[PDB]
């Protein structure tokens, strides 16, 4: 009955905790002792992208690192040129409510989703040049939180209902559905090889999904409130979460626990975006109180603040090569830092 | 200007697009946006069907003005994550059925929803238009089913005028922000031609009391 199986669950989840304590022998802050500190990090703005007329919810850099895409609470979905402040495309959406966007690796498609429970895939390079809807994906109970392109013919999505899914663009039907969450999923991030990904729910937990098989492999606890932003250590063996606990964490995939926590007394506001720098020595973080920070990944100490914004920093992302960091707050502007 | 000939036309394209952006952002500020919230079997459809998945959207025009309502009750997910998208809506329209007060008990659910939304941080500024509909059956349930079922404490005698005003004072006494916002209640039966005129009559009070606040006159 239910009583016996629930009793068994306590034993299995007590076998795990006594199997995650025989591995820990030294924290990350003892290994990294007598290691030279990073030092003051001073960064000034280089651009200001002022096209939008209302709040901005998502952004994603092109692979070449010279083009940007940006979604706001307006019909428009703008494609920016980061070297010179120019617009290359303006797209009018079919629904004013947008909570995500994405830019394909090959550079031939964009994507967008919002509260209408539909994912739209736009096409960019066509004869009779204009931007037209190439495909409409339907079949989500709740609102789309985030999306990502595995390659030109596939895409993973995460929805308000406790589920993640994998889509094939040529034929509308899904191919694999991941259903292990309780609580709303908020964000996901793909591995560098695209053979695994990590998603963060609202029940203060995270998973580790195999794409090909369709089954979870590791479950990571530790937070107290919902999490909202995940990233991958460039190596591909660790990730870092950000929550409304006003606390980031840095888990790892081979020991299956938490190496360190970046939290400070002054901050009580929540975190909305997390990203590593190239070479995994700096972790950027966009706090709720119109500000941002830089944390020394190997040492809990904090690099200098990076605040130029006048409202919430909804989303930010480091460029693929590593030259610059772009943050877009609720006020229409996006400032690029360098 | 150290710009090749091809480079100049990319600036002329960007200044062609800034024209489209303003010329279409100046046509999206004329419309007045409203939000429609209600509980299950409260009678949202009647006022939706009165005047002309996702978030449903509706357009209606009265006496040279354009309104857009957003019926969002089909989301069926946590409201904390997506309700902060809705600031800048001119007014929230809430609607309560009076036929169901006895029926476990819906009214308390209504009260706790109107209380959660009324005191939220995002909606500190915006005003609420409270409909209280389906009063044609509420006239008949008063005699057969007494008002005491919701609250034994209430002293007053059971009259249509004496009960519905007391309920109204039960709803209007839930907002902490007396100074910041007001509530514009209105009784409506199943059929009332005048319903849209009360919304057009109250949004102008909201717009004037915000225009005399933007310049510090108040």
């Amino acid at each position, epitope marked *: 009955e239910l009583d016996q199986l629930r009793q068994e669950a306590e034993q299995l989840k007590n076998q795990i905790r006594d199997a995650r304590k025989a591995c820990a022998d030294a924290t990350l802050s003892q290994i990294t002792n007598n290691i030279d500190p990073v030092g003051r990090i001073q960064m000034r703005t280089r651009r200001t992208l002022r096209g939008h007329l209302a709040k901005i919810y998502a952004m994603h850099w092109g692979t070449d690192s010279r083009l940007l895409v940006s979604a706001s609470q307006d019909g428009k979905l703008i494609i920016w040129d980061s070297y010179t402040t*120019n617009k290359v495309h303006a797209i009018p959406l079919r629904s004013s409510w947008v909570m995500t966007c994405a830019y394909a690796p090959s550079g031939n498609y964009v994507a967008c989703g919002g509260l209408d429970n539909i994912c739209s895939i736009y096409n960019l390079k066509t004869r*009779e*040049g204009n931007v037209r809807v190439s495909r409409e994906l339907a079949g989500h109970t709740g609102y789309l939180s985030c999306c990502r392109f595995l390659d030109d013919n596939q895409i993973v999505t995460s929805s308000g209902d406790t589920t993640c899914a994998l889509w094939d663009i040529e034929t509308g039907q899904q191919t694999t559905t991941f259903t292990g969450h309780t609580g709303d999923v908020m964000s996901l991030s793909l591995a560098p090889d695209t053979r695994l990904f990590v998603s963060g729910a609202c029940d203060a937990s995270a998973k580790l999904w195999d794409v090909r098989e369709g089954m979870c492999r590791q479950t990571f606890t530790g937070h107290e409130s919902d999490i909202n932003a995940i990233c991958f250590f460039p190596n591909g063996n660790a990730f870092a979460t950000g929550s409304d606990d006003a606390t980031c964490r840095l888990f790892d995939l081979r020991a299956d626990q938490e190496l360190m926590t970046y939290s400070h007394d002054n901050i009580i506001c929540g975190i909305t975006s997390v990203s590593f720098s190239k070479s995994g020595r700096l972790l950027l973080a966009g706090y709720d109180d119109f500000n941002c920070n830089v944390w020394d990944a190997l040492k809990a100490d904090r690099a200098g603040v990076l605040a130029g914004h006048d409202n919430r920093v909804s989303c930010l992302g480091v460029t693929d090569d590593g030259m610059a960091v772009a943050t877009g707050s609720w006020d229409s502007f996006l400032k690029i830092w360098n | 200007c150290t710009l090749s*000939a*091809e*480079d100049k*036309a990319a600036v*002329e*394209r960007s200044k062609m697009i800034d024209r489209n952006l303003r010329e279409d952002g100046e046509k999206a500020a004329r419309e007045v946006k409203l939000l429609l919230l209600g509980a299950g079997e409260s009678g949202k459809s009647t006022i939706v069907k009165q005047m002309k998945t996702g978030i449903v959207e509706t357009h209606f025009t009265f006496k040279d003005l354009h309104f857009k309502m957003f019926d969002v009750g089909g989301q069926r997910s946590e409201r904390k994550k997506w309700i902060h998208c809705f600031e800048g809506v001119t007014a929230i329209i809430f609607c309560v059925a009076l036929s169901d007060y006895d029926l476990m008990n819906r009214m308390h659910e209504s009260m706790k929803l109107f209380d959660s939304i009324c005191n939220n941080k995002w909606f500190t500024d915006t005003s609420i238009i409270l409909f209280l509909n389906k009063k044609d059956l509420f006239e008949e349930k008063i005699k057969k089913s007494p008002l005491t079922i919701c609250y034994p404490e209430y002293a007053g005698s059971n009259t249509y005028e004496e009960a519905a005003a007391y309920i109204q004072c039960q709803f209007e006494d839930l907002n902490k922000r007396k100074d910041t916002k007001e509530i514009y209640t209105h009784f409506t039966c199943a059929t009332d031609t005048k319903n849209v005129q009360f919304v057009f009559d109250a949004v102008t009070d909201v717009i004037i009391k915000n225009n005399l606040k933007d310049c510090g006159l108040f």
Partner: single-chain antibody
Framework: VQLVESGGGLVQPGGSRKLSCSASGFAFSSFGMHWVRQAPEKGLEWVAYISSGSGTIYYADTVKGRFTISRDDPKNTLFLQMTSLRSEDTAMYYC??????????????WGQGTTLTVSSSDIVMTQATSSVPVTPGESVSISCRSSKSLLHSNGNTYLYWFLQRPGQSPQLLIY???NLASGVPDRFSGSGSGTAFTLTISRLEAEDVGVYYCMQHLEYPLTFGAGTKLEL
């Protein structure tokens, strides 16, 4: 995505005929437009231009003040009106489309043109090989030279290549240095440096036997190079 043109015919000198070009199949309101003429046997030449929105109009030197170009966006038509035609204004008039943003391909599609018979400090491009014989399956290289450094400070060198098969309109092959126009076989490739250029065909079939042209697009007025005819 066809562009059809009309006008032409036989005109006595001094009488001004007009030319129309009726587009159908694309978004006409966001493309710049051109006109390119070809004399009876000579290489192409650049008559005029218009930007998007008719906000910027240029001209050539020999028609500056004699021709007037104008566009009609709602009716999808491009007009060129000629005035007091001279005996040396006899040429077929093609009509060329072009869009300018980051990463686009100008001169991607060309009209078929009309035939007009009037009765009776500039960058010099150079290619000086004509009627070069070729055999299918060989590797053929064709060279070009310019009179000024086409390499701009930003790293783009503005040099376009084209191909006119006998009896057809010309066709874009390489949009800039080290680039391949979409829709063309991968055989073609071109590598330059400074002001020396070349186009190389690794293994050619017998379908591409036609004249090749080369254009600088760096600054107006867009000169073209002489012809280079491949004979079989």
């Amino acid at each position: 995505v066809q562009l059809v043109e009309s006008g032409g015919g036989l005109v006595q000198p001094g009488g001004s005929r007009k030319l129309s070009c009726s587009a159908s199949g694309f978004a006409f309101s966001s493309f710049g437009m051109h006109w390119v003429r070809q004399a009876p046997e000579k290489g192409l030449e650049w008559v005029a231009y218009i930007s998007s929105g008719s906000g910027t109009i240029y001209y050539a030197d020999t028609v500056k003040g004699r021709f007037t170009i104008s566009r009609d966006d709602p009716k999808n038509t491009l007009f060129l009106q000629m005035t007091s035609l001279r005996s040396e204004d006899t040429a077929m008039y093609y009509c060329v489309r072009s869009i300018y943003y980051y990463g686009s391909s100008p001169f991607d599609f060309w009209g078929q043109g009309t035939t007009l018979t009037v009765s009776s400090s500039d960058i010099v491009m150079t290619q000086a090989t004509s009627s070069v014989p070729v055999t299918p399956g060989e590797s053929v290289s064709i060279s070009c030279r310019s009179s000024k450094s086409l390499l701009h400070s930003n790293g783009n060198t503005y040099l376009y290549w084209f191909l006119q098969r006998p009896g057809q309109s010309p066709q874009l092959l390489i949009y800039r240095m080290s680039n391949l126009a979409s829709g063309v076989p991968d055989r073609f490739s071109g590598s330059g440096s400074g002001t020396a250029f070349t186009l190389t065909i690794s293994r050619l079939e017998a379908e591409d036997v036609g004249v090749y042209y080369c254009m600088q697009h760096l600054e107006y007025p867009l000169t073209f190079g002489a012809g280079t005819k491949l004979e079989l």
